[PDB]
Amino acid sequence: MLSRRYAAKSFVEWYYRQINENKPVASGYVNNNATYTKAGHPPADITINGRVVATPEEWDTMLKEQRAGRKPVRYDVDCFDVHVINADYRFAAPQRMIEQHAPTDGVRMMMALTVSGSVYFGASPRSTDDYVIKQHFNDVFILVPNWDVLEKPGARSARKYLIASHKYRAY
């Protein structure tokens, strides 16, 4: 499996598992990371259904707002795809990271991720037929490496790459 696809698939799984488990997803954003903040990275660019959001916490709150035997809100990832838009990402990186890892090692890469699926409101946790209303969602992320983690042998795809940009759409 491709290194990018693995990171992508895994991030996707975590993210939507966290949303469906009613857990905060702010951690996955570059805003809460200390290294990037120390390096002087802008806050993550989050856009929900056309509304610009200031912080991932606000987005996490919106996710709670939306939730107000049947599950209130559930996300079903139908598909996703990831591209590499920087092979040589060096921002906020220690010096060692640049010399040890090459662009062909599939670690120092800025990724453009797109995810598309459905959104079932007031439906059975396992049924895709019965629902109050069904939306179609299409997410778009820009993922950056987490320099603090790629040193640690232990691996969470959740931390392994961080969100710098987010575009949520649902209709």
Binding site: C79, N86, V140, S165
Partner: protein
């Protein structure tokens, strides 16, 4: 008590020059009639193109086309149902030919498009004088009229398309280029075929 998120109008933060609107207008105008000309204009060696299918519609053209493409390619053997397809700079031209004939609406109709876009940092600098360069992400949600003429197949496609725009190489046609093109085809609903009578 559930209530879906609020659906605001599409905010196009393409700055003061409105480059996104121009690019999109030109791109789809070209995509419809002579898409291949887009490649020398906006595409590069570093460019990458993907097509994904979010759902398995009955007898849709794109699936069959992409299937034939994947089967035809000597480069690998996958089997029956393909969810996605990925190609580098060298096979984009060969893939765009196989894709169905499409007719998109004008951007004047805001009711038909959901275009979100913004500029982000830390892209690569093709000129190589600076470490970083700034890029423009353009996520487009919309629909169009998709058609296969060889078969008698005609219908309406709902889709999402993500463009990653960045600064171009020296001696390029335009000041910018497409770094990544991610196409997602949600659904295909059959529609009546247009007919022309002559005498």
């Amino acid at each position: 008590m559930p209530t879906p998120l609020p659906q605001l109008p599409s905010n196009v933060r393409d700055g003061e020059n409105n480059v996104a609107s121009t690019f999109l207008q030109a791109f789809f105008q070209l995509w419809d009639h002579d898409r291949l000309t887009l490649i020398p204009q906006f595409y590069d060696s570093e460019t990458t193109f993907s097509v994904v299918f979010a759902t398995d519609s009955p007898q849709d053209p794109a699936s069959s086309s992409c299937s034939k493409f994947s089967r035809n390619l000597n480069i690998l053997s996958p089997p029956s149902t393909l969810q996605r397809l990925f190609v580098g700079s060298n096979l984009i031209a060969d893939l765009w030919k196989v894709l169905p004939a499409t007719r998109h609406p004008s951007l004047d109709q805001t009711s038909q498009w959901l275009i979100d876009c913004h500029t982000f940092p830390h892209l690569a600098d093709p000129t190589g004088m600076a470490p970083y360069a700034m890029g423009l992400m353009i996520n487009v949600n919309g629909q169009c009229e998709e058609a296969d003429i060889s078969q008698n197949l005609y219908g309406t496609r709902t889709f999402s398309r993500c463009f990653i725009l960045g600064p171009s190489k020296p001696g390029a046609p335009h000041p910018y280029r497409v770094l990544s093109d991610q196409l997602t085809l949600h659904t295909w609903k059959p529609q009546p075929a247009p007919q022309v009578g002559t005498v």
